[PDB]
C-alpha cells in the first residue's frame, strides 16, 4: 500500500479522460473499460457540422 | 420526452472550465494509504 497507490492516482486520472472525451457513455464506459468491454456504437448521436 | 417548447441556449464555456476548478476533489488523487495498528 502506497505502492498499489501512487498509480491509483495515475489510474483514476486516465479514467477521468475516457468518461470526459466521450460525454455519451460517460460514467459507464469507464466501468466497461476496466473489465475490458465496449459499448454498442449505433445508439449514440453524433455531430455533422458547426458554423 | 415531455418537453414541448424551445430550450434555452448553451454556453460556450462554463465557469468551472474557465478556472479549471472542481466542486469536489477526489480522495484517491494524492490520497490516503491504509495503516496497520492493532
Amino acid at each position: 500500500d502506497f505502492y498499489n497507490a501512487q498509480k491509483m492516482d495515475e489510474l483514476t486520472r486516465v479514467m477521468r479522460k475516457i468518461c470526459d472525451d466521450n460525454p455519451e457513455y460517460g460514467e459507464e464506459m469507464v466501468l466497461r473499460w476496466a473489465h475490458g468491454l465496449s459499448v454498442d456504437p449505433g445508439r449514440v448521436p453524433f455531430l455533422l457540422a458547426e458554423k | 420526452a415531455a418537453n414541448h417548447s424551445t430550450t434555452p441556449a448553451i454556453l460556450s464555456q462554463t465557469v468551472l472550465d474557465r478556472f479549471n476548478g472542481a466542486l469536489d476533489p477526489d480522495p484517491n488523487v494524492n490520497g490516503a494509504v491504509q495503516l496497520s495498528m492493532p
Partner: peptide, 7 residues
C-alpha cells in the same frame, strides 16, 4: 484506523 496520507 488511520492514514499517513499521500501529499
Amino acid at each position: 484506523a488511520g492514514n499517513v496520507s499521500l501529499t
